[PDB]
């Protein structure tokens, strides 16, 4: 009984509605997915057949983390309904960068660090997001915490090659553009380099396939040499030349990160 357990508010985007849990007035986001549009299906520990997005969310939603957590889900005749956390006030990182332009490196460092920790969490839980981008990152403006959203393109993490992809093409790596093949972790690192450039320059570096495979990063904003080096390393054309998550977080540019509360008070409040 979802119609009686939740009060449904207005649309948040698309089909996600704002909502409130009647049991305790908890703010939630209510996401509806049509069964006809689900291409990837999984099985729960109980054997129940659910969309892969439910499988992945359940795997990452235990304990605290930088992911919007799944609180509950329901099956309807023609759809699935997902009950998600809804922090407030929030702004997604795409709108944040649009409104504020290129971010100061101290702020980009704090944001990038939190995304790395969130992505490490997903990978530790066996989940590959496959659509890391500023549109899929929410900023809790009061707490200075970033939260990953939209696992609808994700997959179980594996060490073998992926040959399917439905994420955002301008964040996808050249091995996908060229050969329709990629490995999970090195593809994630590429999208993270795209995201870091986006933060410190105010928009993504590549729009066309030829730019993605070209291997040339032009900086349209003043960016420190240390930050440029990290970006260019993440955007190595050869996947095996890209850094691991450990090498990213040990990079000199990543040191002395702000705490979330410091980030909020200095840059968001």
């Amino acid at each position: 009984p979802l119609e009686s357990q939740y009060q449904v508010g207005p649309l948040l985007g698309s089909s996600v509605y704002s909502g409130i849990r009647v049991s305790d007035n908890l703010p939630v986001a209510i996401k509806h997915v049509e069964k006809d549009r689900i291409s990837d299906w999984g099985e729960l520990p109980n054997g129940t057949r659910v969309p892969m997005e439910v499988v992945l969310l359940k795997k990452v939603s235990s304990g605290f983390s930088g992911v919007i957590r799944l609180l509950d889900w329901f099956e309807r005749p023609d759809s699935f309904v997902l009950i998600l956390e809804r922090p407030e006030p929030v702004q997604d990182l795409f709108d944040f960068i649009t409104e504020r332009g290129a971010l100061q490196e101290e702020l980009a460092r704090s944001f990038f660090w939190q995304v790395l920790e969130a992505v490490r969490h997903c990978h530790n839980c066996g989940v590959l997001h496959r659509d890391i981008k500023d549109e899929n990152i929410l900023i809790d403006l009061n707490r200075g915490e970033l939260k990953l959203i939209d696992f609808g393109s994700g997959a179980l993490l594996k060490d073998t090659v992926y040959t399917d992809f439905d994420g955002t093409r301008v964040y996808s790596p050249p091995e996908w553009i060229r050969y329709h093949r990629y490995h999970g972790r090195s593809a994630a690192v590429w999208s993270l380099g795209i995201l870091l450039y986006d933060m410190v320059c105010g928009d993504i570096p590549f729009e066309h396939d030829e730019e993605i495979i070209g291997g040339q990063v032009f900086f349209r904003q003043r960016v420190s040499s240390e930050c440029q080096h990290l970006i260019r390393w993440c955007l190595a054309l050869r996947p095996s030349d890209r850094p691991t998550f450990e090498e990213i977080q040990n990079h000199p540019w990543m040191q002395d990160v702000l705490l979330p509360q410091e980030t909020a008070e200095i840059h968001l409040h």
Binding site: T98, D131, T168, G202, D203
Partner: peptide, 8 residues
């Protein structure tokens, strides 16, 4: 310069 979202 035009900045835009990109659908998945």
């Amino acid at each position: 310069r035009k900045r835009r979202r990109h659908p998945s």
